[model samples]
Target: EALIRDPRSPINVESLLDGLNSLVLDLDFPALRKNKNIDNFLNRYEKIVKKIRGLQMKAEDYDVVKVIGRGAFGEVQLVRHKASQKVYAMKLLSKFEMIKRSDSAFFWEERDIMAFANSPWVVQLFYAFQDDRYLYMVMEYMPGGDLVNLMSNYDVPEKWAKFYTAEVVLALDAIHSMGLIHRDVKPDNMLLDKHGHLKLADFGTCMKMDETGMVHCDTAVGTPDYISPEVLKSQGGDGFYGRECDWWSVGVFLYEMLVGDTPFYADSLVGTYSKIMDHKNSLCFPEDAEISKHAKNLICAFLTDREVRLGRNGVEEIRQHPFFKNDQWHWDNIRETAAPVVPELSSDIDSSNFDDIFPIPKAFVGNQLPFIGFTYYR
Candidate 1:
């Protein structure tokens, strides 16, 4: 803190790394049995340094609280940094499991995205490290849980739903502006901080657009219920599609938020995928659901064909849409606006608000022979 706040001290990149390395050596992190090289954020190395700092800490510096979320790779835990008593979410991914998979580059790709797109609207990645057996990513601890958690219990009012969805417009805008795609955008992945502001997480499906101005990618990845038709077609051996698939996800998210159920849900997984793929670029709104025209129109625009969708021209179209037709549409205000439900915490260590689930689970460089043939360069 003193070094950062001082006005005259010269900044030393090596010293900064040293300080981080020093901190963990003095503490107890159980994962440090080997002297393997720590993975630093990317380069020119310049972009990563400007965005966030690298760390030398390992999994043992903090006390693992209960697990917050679980996925195929691993579970995320709410951990308390012992020295500072501050809390952060920790992801543990088994390297043995990752190495056996064809998508070994997935962890590295997501880490690169988080390292670069370090915006407030998205979940923040503070540091990344790895061990001989697993990889770790320390991220901001979101106590308010996910937007889906809230919507599942009670119907979100129009005003709050609009506010949250509009914030996503900024999040997606920030991503698309960088010529990247956040191919996954669903409520479960959208977390809420203590301030109640939404923070989009999970970048495993992220990809950058090609230099040819073509937004096509062959991989059809993301959650089944939230994925768009383009992704499904691509999954089934189609060649290419656009970033507009994310907009479709955004629309699906909004619909899910307003109604307590998924817009295209059917009796079975195959039926649901078929419903999404077979729909004629339109949806039949439930008659009993209470929703405004502006809200419905914006979501419909998101659900429409990619070329004519909400952000075909740019983010401004979504921003200027009737749903976000208010002064708080600006990023600054939306960021500060008191969120509908801030997680109540007397101090930073409080974990009373998060759900108790079975826990915890990015990236690469150097000496990896398997990844040599499959690099996703920036």
Candidate 2:
């Protein structure tokens, strides 16, 4: 009764009264206290209230252009910063949903880990905000989407693959140096920029380690095909694995990029896990797969046993690989070296195509962001 009457209570008495006046409200407090269904319903009601409050907090500040991506817990929308006119990808997560599901730890861990990572190849977090119902992360916008889309849409040549792999290796090196393990490192988590540069995203499963750079992670996390064997076993092996496991996942990704299939696969989920745990190395590569020998060697090195798997060496070895032997190959030289792949934008082209791709942001009344003015070539 105090809760229903108290202004400071979760629902705010005045709001509750207003809602009750409009509906046939039940006042069986004793029955509600004993009923599990009633408790769940009230909890869901509170979460909806919180979400509404959060939406109200930021509703006028920015215009949500369009949904660029969706995840299990949240969705990412392309939004324009009202003051700066800068475009950003806004990740909206429900705080109520997280707390109710006891998944707040993962959200906080992702935020903390991402705060420590500042690499060109990693997505940059601009700021974070919270309201009654949700949390918001404003992140750098990557125009090229994720690696899976890139690989599927365009045939990534050996040289292009080498360049992208080197960038990711450097990114992994940076993350490992910080003593944080990115448990998930699949193609879907790697985004690309307009210039085709790789940017790592989705640090939801990342974790920190002790002084020795190892932690007992009993939770078997990550995609089935990409998860390390040590993670799958969860016992008697590497009491704790550090960032090196991420390198192993990277190796799996490289193999997939080269061969167009996971090294371990089966007809069913159980069979797939079995293959990943026991038969990873038994898989055969295509005889005519068009990847460089150096690239293949580096991938193999990363895929070896966890004790000797390439960690720090992964970046340098990828750099020294023969696939990157072209002296003229650099970030700037991507467009000059080939046919079928041309500059994204020409010097003399107009901006009509930009309008077609991006939503008409309400915040941008007259002019668009300044960076969009730069010419992008095919």
Which lDDT values do the candidates have, in the order given? 0.69, 0.63
Q: Which stretches of candidate 2 lie over 4 Å from their true place?
A: 1-59, 100-102, 113-116, 235-239, 312-318, 321-324, 329-378
TM-score: model 2 vs. ground truth: 0.69
Tell me each candidate's RMSD, in Å, in order: 9.3, 12.4
lDDT string, candidate 2, 55-165, tens digits: 432534766777777776688778887766777777777654654554455765565454446666578776655443456777777766577876776777766667666
Model 2 accuracy (lDDT, Cα): 0.63
User: What would the per-residue lDDT of candidate 1 be over residues 181-287, giving only the tens digit for each residue?
Assistant: 88889998888888888888888777788875346667778888888878877876754766678889999988988877788888898888878876664376889
Error of 2 at 341 (Å): 7.2
Candidate 1 residue-pair clash tally: 6
Leading candidate by lDDT: 1
